[PDB]
Each structure stands twice: as C-alpha cells, then as structure tokens.
Amino acid sequence: EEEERAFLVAREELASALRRDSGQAFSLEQLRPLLASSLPLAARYLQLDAARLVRCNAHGEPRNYLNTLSTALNILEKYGRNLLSPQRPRYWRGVKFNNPVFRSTVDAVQGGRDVLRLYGYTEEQPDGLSFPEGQEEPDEHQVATVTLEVLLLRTELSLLLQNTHPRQQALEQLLE
C-alpha cells in the first residue's frame, strides 16, 4: 500500500525528468523507491522483460554475465536517452546490428534486440531495426518509461556486483 504507492509516483516522476532533460543523471537515492521496493518483478517492470533478460543470459560466473548484461543495458539506455533529447541524432529512426559497439554489447545478450522494439524500432530489416515509415516523432512517454526500466535493471545489476543491493541476499537465491 504505502510502498506500492511511492513506486508508481517515483516511476512517473523520473520518467518525466528524462523527458525534460534526457542527459539528467539519477542518484541511488532518487531510484531508491524503485530498488528497495518489495513489489514483485511483474509489477516493477511493465515493459522491459527483466525476468527473460536475466534468465536467458545467466551463463557462467555471476561476476561476468551480470557485467555483460549491465554493459548491454548501458548501451540500450543511451538509445532511449538520445530519442528524448531535443537534439536527436541524424539517424534516430534506425539502428544497425553491424555496429561494432552494438555487436559487442547488445547483440551479445540474448534478447537485447527486443529491447529496441520497445523503443519503437518495430520494423525488421536484414541489417537492423527501424522506426515505422509514417511515425514522425517517437512516443516520449513510451521511450522514457522503457529507458527508466532499462536504467533501473542496470542499476540493480550494478548494485549486485558491488554487494550493495537492498535485496542482495534475496536476489542471490535466484542465481545459485
């Protein structure tokens, strides 16, 4: 009740801060209503399939695949931040799979391509994904909400790698 109410408030608040300033940095205190929340994962991540991304990429030592997942999420977070900035990139409506950074980070994670579809890159192409022909501008509320969930999962994976997660003992039971 009281904890579930502060979660939806912080989610809508931080999503607008990304729309107001796409380059805004968030501290661990600003995201604490979303990290320390004892809400189930289905209620915490409404768009980003956090359960899938963790399940399909938990291979090897946790010191490595949590690091590989966090790096791919940092790249995916930059894609959503670029869409929300007033000075959008010249090729904002098209991501190519053969990018050297993309192939070494996002394409190295099972399900990283599907995260781009959440931003709006829904049209499949033999070299990448693209925004649909006709969509003049991206849905800011959709991009900001997905960017916040991507940034939140990256923060959650980062907190686990430093043994500083609020539910560190609980999350480690799902990997051992």
Place this chain on the structure above:
Amino acid sequence: EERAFLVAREELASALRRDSGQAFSLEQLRPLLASSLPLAARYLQLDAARLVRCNAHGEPRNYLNTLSTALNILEKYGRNLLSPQRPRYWRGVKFNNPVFRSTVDAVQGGRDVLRLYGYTEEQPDGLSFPEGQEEPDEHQVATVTLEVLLLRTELSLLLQNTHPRQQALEQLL
C-alpha cells in the same frame, strides 16, 4: 549437403501429413542428426538456439530432460493438428492444463512454439487460433512438428551419450 538436408526435410514433413501418429526411427532422422550445417540452417522455424540458451540452468542431466519432455508435449500438439480426426478443442490451448503447466510452461519459450503452430491470439487463460481461420496451416504445422521432433531427439541422444556430434555439443554447455 544443404540440398540433401532440405530434401529429407520435405520428406519427413510430408510423412507427418500422411500419418500424424507415425513413429520415426534414428535411421530415418540420420540425414538430419549427423550433419555439419549450422543450427540456423537446420532449424528454420523453431528457435533451438534460444530454447537451449534460455533453459540451460543447473545440471545438464536435469534441464536437458525437462527440455525434451516439454518438446515431447509440443510435438504431440503439432501431431494432433495433423490428425484426420483433430481433437474437439484443437482451436485453443489452456495455460492451466495440468500437463501443459508442468512441461511446456516450465520452459522459457514453450508458448512461442505454440504460436508457431498457429495459436497466435493471446487470451488470459491460454492461446488460441484466430477465429476466422477454418483449418490450421498444414505445411507450417508439419514443419514445426518435425523441427520440434528433431530437437527433442537431439536432446535425447545427448543424454544417452550416443549423439553423432556428442563431443562438440558438450563443449557448447
């Protein structure tokens, strides 16, 4: 070798349409098992790469058996759609089924295999065919059924240590 593999694909797929309850031997699947082609060339509809990657948790003797059991149930669903007397409830699959929730729904991506059969419409209690579709896609159902049968056979051969490429497959886990 890509031509010989594609010829045996249409051969077994046409055999499933002829008799949906026809049992295949290891020799009949030999041109598909012993093969040097990549996985993307051997599995066109079934995403065998993610089906193993998203479910290779724990001991291999455990999750390979769970994967093959779920594929055995998914194979029966495709064979039922190719039967001359289809089940009376072939148009939909319920998530709350005791057999379904214990085998297919226990595997990440098992519902995606049902979508390949034709169960594309999502409902709160399961998946169903589009209401405007009279009959299932026999060519598509037979193709997915054969690939599901092949993946389950490959997982089974790994557990018996009789896979033709057993050594190479074990290094991928």
Place this chain on the structure above:
Amino acid sequence: EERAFLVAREELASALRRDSGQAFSLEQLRPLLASSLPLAARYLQLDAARLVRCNAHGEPRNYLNTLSTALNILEKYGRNLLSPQRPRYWRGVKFNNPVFRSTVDAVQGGRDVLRLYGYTEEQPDGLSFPEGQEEPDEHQVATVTLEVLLLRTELSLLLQNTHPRQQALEQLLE
C-alpha cells in the same frame, strides 16, 4: 520384513549424515526396492502416494520423467542441508528460481517436500526456515532426503523397465 527394512533405513540415513555427497548404488538400495511391504511403511515422511497420484497425468514416459527430475532437485536440497560446507543461503528457497519453476514447482506437492526439510514459513516469493531455528534437524532432513532418493530411484527404474516389481507397479497406473 519390517525390522529388516528399518535396519537398512538408518544405515543409509546415517551415511547421508556423515557424507552428504556419498552416492548410493543400486545394490545398496535394492533391499529397499524389492520389498513387498506397503507404501505406508516404506515412506514415513515423504507422501509418495501424493506425488505419484496427483501427477500421473498424460503419458507415463512424460510425467515419470517430470517426477524424477523434480525429486532429483529435491534430493539436492536435502543433501546440501546436511553438507558440512552448507550454502550461504540454505535457510530460504525462492519460488522464482529458474531451476525451481521447471522442476519442483512443476509437480503438485513439491513445495510440501521443502516443508518436510524445514522450510515451514511461507513468503510471497518462496519458503524459508523460521527465524528461531538456527540448524536443521539433521535426522529429519536425512530421513526425507533418503525417501526422496528412494522415490527417484523407483521412478527411474520403472522408466528403464528394470524395477524389481515392475509389473506390479505398472498395474497401478492403468
């Protein structure tokens, strides 16, 4: 035959107490396999009738595999509870563990086996030990682990058609 069954029962239950990783052979469990004693006397803690009856749905080649794999993971939980180098989080089990959903939670009554191990208190996301309890009942854990080991072996031998009472047990699944 009841005294002979209990004689080898504590012999295997004590072997798991000293060495939890010590694997048992078929000849070691055969005295407990070919016994014509009723199931009520062979399983005192594990509800073997519940696990088989409530999950014998579909083809026997399918649910016997699902039952065997779930018990193999349940046997790993009991063995780790008796290990001298216990895991750091032996006091709790999460339902959303990717191995748990595909094996134990896929079987009707699998969570009750964890309660026999000691995981009696329930959380919205799993089961855990009571806060007052600091060490598990090594006698009860080894007793349940042995019976879980017993049921897994019985289901595995039936799938291989090498069970000592194969024809008798097959008549209970028609």
